Write a protein that holds these residues in place. Structure first.
Motif, PDB file in Angstrom:
ATOM      1  N   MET B 213       0.769  -1.265   0.000  1.00 46.84           N
ATOM      2  CA  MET B 213       0.000   0.000   0.000  1.00 46.84           C
ATOM      3  C   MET B 213       0.805   1.324   0.000  1.00 46.84           C
ATOM      4  SD  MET B 213      -0.604   1.837   3.270  1.00 46.84           S
ATOM      5  CE  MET B 213      -2.362   1.795   3.640  1.00 46.84           C
ATOM      6  N   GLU B 214       2.063   1.267   0.425  1.00 41.73           N
ATOM      7  CA  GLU B 214       3.011   2.408   0.405  1.00 41.73           C
ATOM      8  C   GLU B 214       3.261   2.936  -1.028  1.00 41.73           C
ATOM      9  OE1 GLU B 214       3.518  -0.380   2.505  1.00 41.73           O
ATOM     10  OE2 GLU B 214       3.665   0.535   4.504  1.00 41.73           O
ATOM     11  N   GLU B 215       3.213   2.043  -2.036  1.00 39.10           N
ATOM     12  CA  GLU B 215       3.247   2.396  -3.495  1.00 39.10           C
ATOM     13  C   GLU B 215       1.840   2.633  -4.068  1.00 39.10           C
ATOM     14  OE1 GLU B 215       6.552   1.870  -3.363  1.00 39.10           O
ATOM     15  OE2 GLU B 215       6.267   0.229  -1.925  1.00 39.10           O
ATOM     16  N   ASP B 216       0.951   1.681  -3.780  1.00 38.47           N
ATOM     17  CA  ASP B 216      -0.344   1.546  -4.433  1.00 38.47           C
ATOM     18  C   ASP B 216      -1.467   2.257  -3.648  1.00 38.47           C
ATOM     19  OD1 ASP B 216      -2.800   0.019  -5.552  1.00 38.47           O
ATOM     20  OD2 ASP B 216      -1.146  -0.729  -6.800  1.00 38.47           O
ATOM     21  N   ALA B 217      -1.512   3.578  -3.806  1.00 40.87           N
ATOM     22  CA  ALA B 217      -2.357   4.457  -3.001  1.00 40.87           C
ATOM     23  C   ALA B 217      -3.646   4.967  -3.645  1.00 40.87           C
ATOM     24  CB  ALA B 217      -1.510   5.626  -2.554  1.00 40.87           C
ATOM     25  N   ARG B 218      -4.014   4.447  -4.798  1.00 35.75           N
ATOM     26  CA  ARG B 218      -5.227   4.877  -5.499  1.00 35.75           C
ATOM     27  C   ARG B 218      -6.383   3.893  -5.319  1.00 35.75           C
ATOM     28  NH1 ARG B 218      -3.803   4.647 -10.890  1.00 35.75           N
ATOM     29  NH2 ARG B 218      -5.484   6.093 -11.564  1.00 35.75           N
ATOM     30  N   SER B 219      -7.594   4.424  -5.412  1.00 37.17           N
ATOM     31  CA  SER B 219      -8.834   3.670  -5.206  1.00 37.17           C
ATOM     32  C   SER B 219      -9.974   4.376  -5.941  1.00 37.17           C
ATOM     33  CB  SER B 219      -9.182   3.512  -3.701  1.00 37.17           C
ATOM     34  OG  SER B 219      -9.433   4.731  -3.043  1.00 37.17           O
ATOM     35  N   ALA B 220     -11.000   3.597  -6.273  1.00 40.30           N
ATOM     36  CA  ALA B 220     -12.144   4.070  -7.030  1.00 40.30           C
ATOM     37  C   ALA B 220     -13.422   3.528  -6.428  1.00 40.30           C
ATOM     38  CB  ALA B 220     -12.026   3.643  -8.481  1.00 40.30           C
ATOM     39  N   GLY B 221     -14.428   4.377  -6.303  1.00 36.98           N
ATOM     40  CA  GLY B 221     -15.747   3.952  -5.872  1.00 36.98           C
ATOM     41  C   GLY B 221     -15.951   3.799  -4.390  1.00 36.98           C
ATOM     42  N   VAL B 222     -14.948   4.159  -3.608  1.00 31.19           N
ATOM     43  CA  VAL B 222     -15.021   3.928  -2.190  1.00 31.19           C
ATOM     44  C   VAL B 222     -14.616   5.199  -1.484  1.00 31.19           C
ATOM     45  CG1 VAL B 222     -12.693   2.928  -2.046  1.00 31.19           C
ATOM     46  CG2 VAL B 222     -14.483   2.283  -0.328  1.00 31.19           C
ATOM     47  N   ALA B 223     -15.246   5.428  -0.337  1.00 33.45           N
ATOM     48  CA  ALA B 223     -14.979   6.563   0.525  1.00 33.45           C
ATOM     49  C   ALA B 223     -13.775   6.266   1.412  1.00 33.45           C
ATOM     50  CB  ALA B 223     -16.185   6.835   1.378  1.00 33.45           C
ATOM     51  N   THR B 224     -12.866   7.228   1.524  1.00 31.63           N
ATOM     52  CA  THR B 224     -11.691   7.108   2.374  1.00 31.63           C
ATOM     53  C   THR B 224     -12.067   7.321   3.838  1.00 31.63           C
ATOM     54  OG1 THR B 224     -11.069   9.443   2.152  1.00 31.63           O
ATOM     55  CG2 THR B 224     -10.162   7.868   0.546  1.00 31.63           C
TER      56      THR B 224
END
Ligand SMILES: N[C@H](C(=O)N1Cc2ccccc2C1)[C@H]1CC[C@H](N2CCCC2)CC1
Ligand SMILES: N[C@H](C(=O)N1Cc2ccccc2C1)[C@H]1CC[C@H](N2CCCC2)CC1
Ligand SMILES: N[C@H](C(=O)N1Cc2ccccc2C1)[C@H]1CC[C@H](N2CCCC2)CC1
Ligand SMILES: N[C@H](C(=O)N1Cc2ccccc2C1)[C@H]1CC[C@H](N2CCCC2)CC1
Ligand SMILES: N[C@H](C(=O)N1Cc2ccccc2C1)[C@H]1CC[C@H](N2CCCC2)CC1
Ligand SMILES: N[C@H](C(=O)N1Cc2ccccc2C1)[C@H]1CC[C@H](N2CCCC2)CC1
Ligand SMILES: N[C@H](C(=O)N1Cc2ccccc2C1)[C@H]1CC[C@H](N2CCCC2)CC1
Ligand SMILES: N[C@H](C(=O)N1Cc2ccccc2C1)[C@H]1CC[C@H](N2CCCC2)CC1
Ligand SMILES: N[C@H](C(=O)N1Cc2ccccc2C1)[C@H]1CC[C@H](N2CCCC2)CC1
Ligand SMILES: N[C@H](C(=O)N1Cc2ccccc2C1)[C@H]1CC[C@H](N2CCCC2)CC1
Ligand SMILES: N[C@H](C(=O)N1Cc2ccccc2C1)[C@H]1CC[C@H](N2CCCC2)CC1
Ligand SMILES: N[C@H](C(=O)N1Cc2ccccc2C1)[C@H]1CC[C@H](N2CCCC2)CC1
Ligand SMILES: N[C@H](C(=O)N1Cc2ccccc2C1)[C@H]1CC[C@H](N2CCCC2)CC1
Ligand SMILES: N[C@H](C(=O)N1Cc2ccccc2C1)[C@H]1CC[C@H](N2CCCC2)CC1
Lengths: 852, 852
Positions: B213-224
């Motif tokens: 997750m330190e590299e892969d920090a993007r997301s779609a369709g979900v609330a942070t």
């Protein structure tokens, strides 16, 4: 029957004062006594001094540890007592080297070495040149004194080894073959540096600092956690002590080194000290029953030209894999070189730590690293079949090998024969000195034939194995104790327990024709000694129960009629004790014949102003694990001053060395193999009951127990096993699950978890939470929150189960601490809370009043 | 003067029994009352029932939350009371869907939503088809009832949506345009699935699960995190409710979605629940004054053929960057679509949360994602300049915007005009309903001209803004409260505080010609209600201080003479209370006129068997932070039963709603802007002193305070500010440093740290450790060790400073808990320790006796 004595019930603020007041005058004693001695001859027939001694010390409190020298005169006035002046070697007049501001690497190394001293922790010396080399803080420094350059009469400017390296340099060592060269470790790789030319070269390319540690798990020249924590090995590279000359006028230097791969070692996370970050650092931690690092030996071959410039560096590896050549070896415990450089040596353990072997490794056994598969075969085939490892000594035990620092190789008489002194508990059950001669014959294994070597194929036969010492007492070889061999007079000096298990003494004996062991130190004190390399003086740091540590120099001679017979004369004082500490009453050493067959020793601190016909609450302070002896004839008023404080408030204080303790031999130590937690409390209670039948002042209805580390472990076991006896238990930094402790310790004493299912169960407090009391004010847990040795999870998991079991607990955390107390305020708080807890829950009137 | 009453001093075991016994008969009350109602018309003129209602509930304790239905009859016997039978919708007869075995993603979502219920937490319905859709454990399931297919008379088999996805699927939603299609989230990307064809397609390619997750920090369709924790938004994608037909016979579906990039958000480490691993999980946690996620809107355009097969998916992005189009917006608070699908809408906040705007976003404003720079310009230039965002409403405040779920868009009369109902506290200081009509004019900003738009350029003028409600009382719009609009009768149903701040009631009013607000619910109870979509029934879940929660159905009609006038008739009971709880004495609500200008309300629990002329120890239970009201006319015997237990042992128990509490309007709530920790204790003490002057049984020499979360925060502040008044403080899961709490909460109430240096200082307990008492047995800290909301470091840092300051503390950790108690044994232990601590340190004879 007797009336109970209740301690005076102070407020928290009042206790804070009381504790502060008793520590005020007592601030001098936090200061390192002179150590790391070295004697150098003046060789000045017209001068008044025979030697100059160099040593590390602090001049006082709140001042750094540094190099000093003193002058040993040829003659003394025997009417008087000579106090040697401490002359500082370095120019530190408006010039500090070490502040307390450490890197992570230094912080951790200090935890592993257990050092709390600011400044120079150690140094190297090259006698040919007079070159001192030492790390102090950030920097690596050198000065010259005692060689051809002569003897300074004034302090020297430390000369910084300059660098282009971005990060802390660690573990500096002088090349014994060429004192213009040093090596050091930087970001887990080995570098060298020339202190004259300023040339600096990286030798190993095993670690990238820019990579995160989950990928980048290799290192060179450095000892991994378990070696540092459990084997007291901090370095993983060793200079070859001689240079091979080249036909060009140049030379070849060599460094043997350990290369480690921690890839398959489990990763834990410890809370990062910077609590505000709310982060955690990764550590490679081999828990019991899991992978230790993949280790091998490598060798770096460094070609230097006529005027000190590096021509080339050739990284070399073993002709066949480590696991093939050293079948069954898990740990590299120790390594070095033979005095003339012909062979590297290593002391090697199996995983169970019941098999030691000593192995000679020729440099001819290493070839260049070559990925290219054609030229790799050319290199393999070029090394003759006759070149194999030579297992010069192998020993086994039903109990365990205790690693020590004793190993001395004599100069070779004959090419096919090696002569050495080693120590072992495997023959008799007590550690003794043996002179061993092994035959270096060509092995039956021939690589050419294309097989793998059978286990026995590298074993050297033993020509002779003569015991130099023997008896129901040990030679000391760990934690600073070692030997000194006089090859002229053919004698060996060593420290031991011959006269008493409560006192360490210095002894001498012939190694060639061994018999009468001669004690050199005076009875009634315990001594830690070191002997001049020239074998004509020694220094003793000595104390006893009534008298603080002194350091004195003694001259050695022999009578005209018998050069084997050695005698001693006081020469001078280095450090005086400055009387006995006021408002300190020492304990009495007692002993009792256990039903286990052994004499057990203890210390009793009687209450001060002991009123007759009263019975007093009692506190059992405990360690009780291996490698420690609490009860001996040493001054306890520095490290254990608060036991005397407890006594002053009205507690009886008791300390007992149960079975498993140090300095009683391997059978004694072996009592808890597979059985940690099961036996120690029986000994403690037996000693407690011996005292109680003898002394009616001990109130057995109000016994408490307290310890740290193994002591905390046992404090929990006391409460769990014996709630009938121990009213309160104050456990600091305990292990509650042996499966979370490490390979090196745990498997040594408890074996593999699958081969000791019950021992692991019974020894693990957290598996047994239901056995704790359902009354509160009995269990207090203490732990350093940042502890990377005993993870805080030992406590958090125990609490997890206490909570499920519905059992009460009290808890204190020291958020700035690891497996130690290094912040003064943490210690202050701990001591205060301890006294307060004892007052409120054991000792006071209110304690008794709240027990329904 | 009066004699002190001392509580009976029970042992720990005795207290464990007492607590267990009082909870045994009381086990029924841990069970979710009927909720998530939906009314569906039978449309059967010959049948006996007008409607079928569907809802979620548990039939009893130790049983999952599931779908039920009941039958609403056309007529009732008014002599009698109709109990509606709960018929289970699903076949669960030897068939469990949810066990307690949750993924990390589910565990966290449950913490954010604050749900402790096993089973179906929510559902979707498509009225055209009768399709139910719901997640339950691992699976996504569907059944049909109430559409053309008809009405079942027996339980339905749940049909699993099958999948090739390896990991938990989250947030399933039915496409309103085509109920054969669903969407869901899997490993932070949006997928769709057809429940007839079984076709399944990934729409977004923003996250690789195999990356750390330190590299892969993007997301779609979900609330942070902050959206979920601080704005009660859990979804980040919204289906367009209509399909565009294609000339081929197919269609186009659309999903609007939030795409998040958390790369510059700070990473903390929380202890992993599996304590044995001795590891820690990474979380993206935007601490106060640091970066929130980079957010934008994207749109997925999905081309379906004539028989439901996907032809193509086109991922579309905004024509210009989000930060340009929505100048100054930090948070996407809410989003959706207009009823006919012409525009997406969003409610958008600035970072300070003092500026709200409502924006319409045409789909024409999104273009295909194209890396190729030539065809990207062709796509940009093709979108006409007239297509811009339309800010239909903008409001500001000196205090803060409280986000709510009220927003209703009417069908469009005219292309250039939009009509809607919104709620706001910004006009008057109390949340009221407004009917707003905005003009959709072409913006002065033209993209072609090549500049950036000025702040005012997308603002729509307001044609009319009429207040529907008004007064010194609020409409409810958060945490389940909403409105229901009857477009036929031109009325709006809403919940509010008009009659009393201590009772929620249901009201109706005309939206077109607003005046008399008509209350539909009966006085003397607080009500939580929802209204049939057909606006002819509502359901009230109601209780009061003396009477447990009931759920009843009421029919709505109007008189012949006036269809605006609405009246109510009881129809049937859904859930009966089964009497009042035995051995529960409720508190009295009191009030007092504060010197602050406000009436403050409290609850007093008098000691049971109150002897005259005795004075009793007193416990102040506290929350006192925003978004909570403790004091109201609701049944407190379920959630706050232990206050009654305390009363039964002899404690006076007090609860006061200080300024900052909910349901008194924005000025009242605003009292602590920039000033958290500074004012709340003054109110608490004032209420305490009001009571003490009125009732001589309150012993002011023995006052304790206890709370969790903001309550624990304030418990620490009480002890620090007012040690003269509060003898003991038991603080659970406190914030001790506002700089470690999050952006969304902290900046709302305290602003940026640089713009409130003193407020942050004074509000932060850990900066003020020197202000704590130097007597022990006053401070007890409690914390969930795994808490990812209030990190354990709040406690560990406080302790760090308490230790440096030499101050005592008591500590309890719940190692299996986060910011909640979910393991029963943890709760059991907590309650036990609390009662014991109070007994030993406040209430008992021994407590008084140990106070020197
Ligand atoms: N304490 C420093 C020192 O003694 N150094 C010796 C030394 C040796 C090797 C590498 C670096 C150094 C720096 C310097 C002393 C002079 C000081 N001035 C500024 C304030 C007034 C005087 C600057 C620092
Ligand atoms: N601690 C040293 C010091 O203070 N010395 C005083 C002093 C006086 C006489 C002779 C030698 C010395 C060394 C030096 C301080 C600067 C430090 N740099 C490392 C990278 C950034 C800073 C290197 C060491
Ligand atoms: N690795 C061990 C450790 O730190 N332990 C923590 C701990 C806590 C509970 C139970 C067992 C253990 C073992 C230490 C190894 C070195 C030893 N020294 C004592 C004097 C010289 C050698 C002390 C023990
Ligand atoms: N069934 C046993 C047990 O539960 N015991 C309870 C108990 C309590 C007190 C004294 C002895 C005992 C034995 C043990 C369970 C672990 C099992 N291992 C063998 C293969 C891997 C696991 C060995 C036996
Ligand atoms: N049933 C096991 C046992 O009794 N054992 C005895 C025993 C004896 C010889 C060899 C193996 C063993 C294991 C252990 C009891 C405590 C339990 N905890 C987990 C939940 C809370 C308590 C872990 C298992
Ligand atoms: N120097 C030791 C220390 O401070 N330790 C802290 C600590 C933290 C983690 C792991 C091990 C340790 C050991 C102390 C020696 C004296 C003893 N006194 C307490 C009251 C009687 C005498 C306590 C231990
Ligand atoms: N052996 C204990 C004793 O005599 N103590 C004296 C004393 C004084 C100060 C602090 C602790 C102690 C313990 C008693 C054991 C039984 C216990 N009962 C109470 C509830 C049922 C069991 C009472 C205490
Ligand atoms: N509890 C399971 C179930 O009811 N399932 C329904 C269902 C629906 C969708 C996807 C998976 C499943 C599995 C199965 C019931 C029969 C059982 N037998 C083995 C022991 C005796 C009977 C195996 C498990
Ligand atoms: N919890 C479900 C269940 O037990 N059901 C019982 C049941 C009875 C009638 C109709 C539907 C159902 C669903 C299913 C268990 C197996 C599970 N797999 C996911 C990957 C590995 C296992 C999917 C869901
Ligand atoms: N994010 C907040 C939180 O968890 N906090 C922990 C905590 C601890 C100390 C001081 C302040 C805080 C804030 C919560 C937001 C939702 C709110 N709900 C109450 C009823 C409906 C809405 C409760 C607070
Ligand atoms: N010097 C001040 C202080 O130390 N104070 C102590 C104190 C105690 C009680 C009441 C008021 C005060 C003020 C403050 C230090 C931080 C500073 N910021 C401005 C730029 C960034 C940092 C503003 C002033
Ligand atoms: N000196 C500071 C202060 O007093 N401030 C008051 C104040 C008023 C307005 C605006 C800013 C400020 C900061 C703080 C005192 C407590 C201190 N801790 C660190 C070591 C232990 C204690 C942190 C700094
Ligand atoms: N349901 C709540 C709970 O259990 N919480 C645990 C917990 C852990 C972290 C953060 C917040 C919370 C709230 C409790 C409601 C009743 C209250 N009683 C205590 C004695 C009087 C009444 C305690 C809180
Ligand atoms: N206001 C307190 C009181 O009267 N209490 C009654 C009581 C009973 C049960 C538990 C707590 C309490 C507190 C007193 C305040 C001063 C304090 N002095 C002792 C050392 C110097 C200061 C004594 C207590």
């Amino acid at each position: 029957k007797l009336e109970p004595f209740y301690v005076e019930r102070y407020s928290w603020s009042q206790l804070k004062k009381l504790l502060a007041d008793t520590r005020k005058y007592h601030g001098y004693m936090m200061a390192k006594a002179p150590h790391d001695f070295m004697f150098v001859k003046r060789n000045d027939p017209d001068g008044p001094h025979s030697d100059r001694i160099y040593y590390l010390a602090m001049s006082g409190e709140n001042r750094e540890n540094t190099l000093f020298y003193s002058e040993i005169p040829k003659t003394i006035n025997r009417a008087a007592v000579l106090m040697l002046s401490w002359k500082p070697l370095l120019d530190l007049f408006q010039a500090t080297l070490d502040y307390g501001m450490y890197s992570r690497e230094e912080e951790l190394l200090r935890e592993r070495k257990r050092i709390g001293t600011v400044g120079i922790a150690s140094y190297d010396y090259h006698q040919g040149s007079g070159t001192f080399l030492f790390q102090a803080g950030s920097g690596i420094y050198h000065v010259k004194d005692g060689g051809p350059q002569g003897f300074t009469q004034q302090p020297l400017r430390p000369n910084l080894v300059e660098t282009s390296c971005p990060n802390i340099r660690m573990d500096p060592k002088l090349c014994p073959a060429d004192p213009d060269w040093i090596a050091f470790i930087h970001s887990n790789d080995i570098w060298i540096s020339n202190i004259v030319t300023r040339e600096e070269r990286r030798l190993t390319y095993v670690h990238n600092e820019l990579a995160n540690m989950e990928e980048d798990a290799r290192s060179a020249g450095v000892a991994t956690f378990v070696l540092q924590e459990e084997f007291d090995r901090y370095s993983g590279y060793w200079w070859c002590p001689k240079a091979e000359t080249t036909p060009s006028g140049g030379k070849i230097l060599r460094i043997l080194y350990e290369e480690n791969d921690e890839s398959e070692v489990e990763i834990i996370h410890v809370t990062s000290p910077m609590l505000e970050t709310r982060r955690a650092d990764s550590f490679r931690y081999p828990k019991t029953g899991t992978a230790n690092p993949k280790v091998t030996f490598k060798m770096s071959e460094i070609m230097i030209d006529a005027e000190g410039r590096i021509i080339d560096v050739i990284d070399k590896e073993l002709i066949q894999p480590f696991e093939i050549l050293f079948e069954g070896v898990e740990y590299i415990a120790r390594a070095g070189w033979t005095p003339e450089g012909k062979y590297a040596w290593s002391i090697l353990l199996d995983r169970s730590q019941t098999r030691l072997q000593i192995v000679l490794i020729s440099p001819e056994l290493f070839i260049p690293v070559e990925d290219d598969v054609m030229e790799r075969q050319r290199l393999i085939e070029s090394v003759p079949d006759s070149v194999t490892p030579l297992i010069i000594y192998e020993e086994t035990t039903d109990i365990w090998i205790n690693i020590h620092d004793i190993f001395h190789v004599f100069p070779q008489s004959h090419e096919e024969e090696i002569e050495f002194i080693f120590a072992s508990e495997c023959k008799t059950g007590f550690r003794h000195l043996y002179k061993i001669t092994s035959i270096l014959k060509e092995s039956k294994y021939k690589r050419s034939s294309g097989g793998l070597p059978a286990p026995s194929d590298f074993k050297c036969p033993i020509k002779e194995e003569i015991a130099i010492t023997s008896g129901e007492w040990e030679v000391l070889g760990r934690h600073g104790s070692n030997i000194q061999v006089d090859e002229v007079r053919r004698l060996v000096y060593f420290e031991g327990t011959k006269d008493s298990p409560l006192e360490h003494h210095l002894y001498v004996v012939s190694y060639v024709n061994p018999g009468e062991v001669t004690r050199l130190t005076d009875r009634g004190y315990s001594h830690s000694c070191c002997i001049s390399q020239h074998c004509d003086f020694f220094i003793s740091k000595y104390s006893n129960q009534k008298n603080p540590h002194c350091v004195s120099l003694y001259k050695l001679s022999s009578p005209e009629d018998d050069p084997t017979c050695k005698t001693k004369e006081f020469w001078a004082t280095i450090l005086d004790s400055a009387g006995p500490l006021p408002d300190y009453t020492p304990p009495e050493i007692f002993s009792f014949e256990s039903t286990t067959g052994f004499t057990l020793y203890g210390m009793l601190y009687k209450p001060h102003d002991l009123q007759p016909g009263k019975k007093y609450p009692t506190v059992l302070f405990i360690y009780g694990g291996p490698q420690v002896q609490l009860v001996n004839n040493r001054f306890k008023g520095v490290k254990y001053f608060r036991l005397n404080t407890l006594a002053s408030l009205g507690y009886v204080v008791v300390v007992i060395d149960n079975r498993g303790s140090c300095h009683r031999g391997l059978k004694f130590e072996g009592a808890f193999k597979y059985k940690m937690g099961q036996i120690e409390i029986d000994d403690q209670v037996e000693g407690l009951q011996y005292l109680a039948s003898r002394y009616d002042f001990i109130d057995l209805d109000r016994v408490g127990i307290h310890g740290w580390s193994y002591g905390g472990y046992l404090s929990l076991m006391a409460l769990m096993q014996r709630s009938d006896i121990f009213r309160v238990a104050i456990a600091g930094a305990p292990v509650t699950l042996w499966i979370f402790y490490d390979t090196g310790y745990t498997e040594r004493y408890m074996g593999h978890p699958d081969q000791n299912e019950q021992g692991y169960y019974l020894g693990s407090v957290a598996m047994q939470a239901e056995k704790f009391p359902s009354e509160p004010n009995r269990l207090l847990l203490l732990h350093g929150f940042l502890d990377e040795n005993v993870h805080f999870a030992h406590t958090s998991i125990l609490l997890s189960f206490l909570v499920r079991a519905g059992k009460p607990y009290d808890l204190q955390i020291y958020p700035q601490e690891r497996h130690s107390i290094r912040v003064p305020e943490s210690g202050e708080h701990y001591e205060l809370h301890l006294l307060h807890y004892l007052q409120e829950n054991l000792g006071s009137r209110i304690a008794a009043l709240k027990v329904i």
